[PDB]
Structure 1
Amino acid sequence: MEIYEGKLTAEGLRFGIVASRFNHALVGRLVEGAIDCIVRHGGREEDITLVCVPGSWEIPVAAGELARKEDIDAVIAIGVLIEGAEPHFDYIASEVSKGLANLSLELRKPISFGDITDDELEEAIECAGTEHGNKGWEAALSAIEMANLFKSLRLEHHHHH
């Protein structure tokens, strides 16, 4: 049986990172969370690319830019949404949610949802902590597994040729 999965070795991959700077009290923590899991899983960082924007709203349009470059294999969503305004948390969270999704099906490039949607500030204190459930740590890893996977898909296509 033909099976594809991914090792977690970040050797050879060049990554995309988009970060909101709204409530940077948690964003700095996650941003580093991803960079860590990247390089501490073997990947170099001169190939990582970080773009910063105002708020959760703009993350879509940025990733769409990042995924279109030839030399970015996978892109990491990064933001924190605190229930500040229900128009902005319900609409902007689902709109970016689906929005990123449709980018990926469209550009054929893996996007991880590195968002911490906390209903309260306390849930915001739990997930950027010590237990190594640093959402950036995790979504960074999902991206590496998906990076080596689509490198496993397209490699098992291009080299077999």
Structure 2
Amino acid sequence: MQIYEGKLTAEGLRFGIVASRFNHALVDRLVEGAIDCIVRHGGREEDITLVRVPGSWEIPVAAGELARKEDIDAVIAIGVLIRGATPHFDYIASEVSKGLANLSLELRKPITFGVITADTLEQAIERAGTKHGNKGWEAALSAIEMANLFKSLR
């Protein structure tokens, strides 16, 4: 039984982060979480590319441009979506998730999902560096593990 798995060392890995600007008060907590995870697992702060896009709808196209780069090992997508009073939330969330998944399959590169989809502001706050943890940290950890796994699988 051949077993493949990824270690949690970030030595020599290069990451891209695409972060939205809407709900920036929570998005920047998520971004700090992701960067802290990368640095404290042994990565270098100079191996991180950060792209800021105006809203969550624009994440897939910028992520596609970042992932088409040769010197990027994994891409981390970060955003916050909070349901309002219309179905706008439903359509935006479905499009963002579908776009990211299709892009990852097409380019054969890891793209981790770090987007919060909350019904209320209280849930959104809970998941951005509060009692339920930090989604940016989780997404960065997943990206590190997948980059190492793909390196060993290649």
TM-score (norm 2): 0.96
Query: Matched residue of 2:47: which SS?
Result: coil
Aligned to 1:56: 56
| CA gap 1:64/1:130 in 2 versus in 1, 3 angstroms | same
Q: After superposition, what is the alpha-carbon deviation per residue over 1:74-97, rounded to whole angstroms, capped at 9, x for unaligned? A: 000100001135332111111110
Q: After superposition, what is the alpha-carbon deviation per residue over 1:47-96, rounded to whole angstroms, capped at 9, x for unaligned? A: 11100011011000000000000000100010000113533211111111
Does the CA-based 8 Å contact 2:126-2:132 persist in structure 1?
A: no
Q: Decide which moves more: 51-60 or 127-136.
A: 127-136
Matched length: 154
Q: How far 1:132 moved relative to its partner?
A: 6.9
Distance 2:100 2:82 in 1: 19
| CA gap 1:67/1:31 in 2 versus in 1, 3 angstroms | same
Note the residue ranges of structure 1 that are not aligned, 5 or more in a row: 155-161
Note the residue ranges of structure 2 that are not aligned, 5 or more in a row: none
Q: Give RMSD over aligned pairs.
A: 1.2
Q: After superposition, what is the alpha-carbon deviation per residue over 1:97-120, rounded to whole angstroms, capped at 9, x for unaligned? A: 010000001000001110111100
Does the CA-based 8 Å contact 2:33-2:137 persist in structure 1?
A: yes
Q: After superposition, what is the alpha-carbon deviation per residue over 1:7-35, rounded to whole angstroms, capped at 9, x for unaligned? A: 10000100010000001010010001100
Distance 1:104 1:28 in 2: 24
| CA gap 1:109/1:123 in 2 versus in 1, 3 angstroms | same
TM-score (norm 1): 0.92
Between the aligned residues of both structures, percent identity stands at 92
Q: Deviation above 2 Å: which 4+ runs of structure 1?
A: 84-88, 129-132
Does the CA-based 8 Å contact 2:19-2:52 persist in structure 1?
A: yes
Query: Matched residue of 2:8: which SS?
Result: coil
Distance 1:88 1:45 in 2: 36
Distance 1:132 1:141 in 2: 16
Q: How far 1:130 moved relative to its partner?
A: 4.1
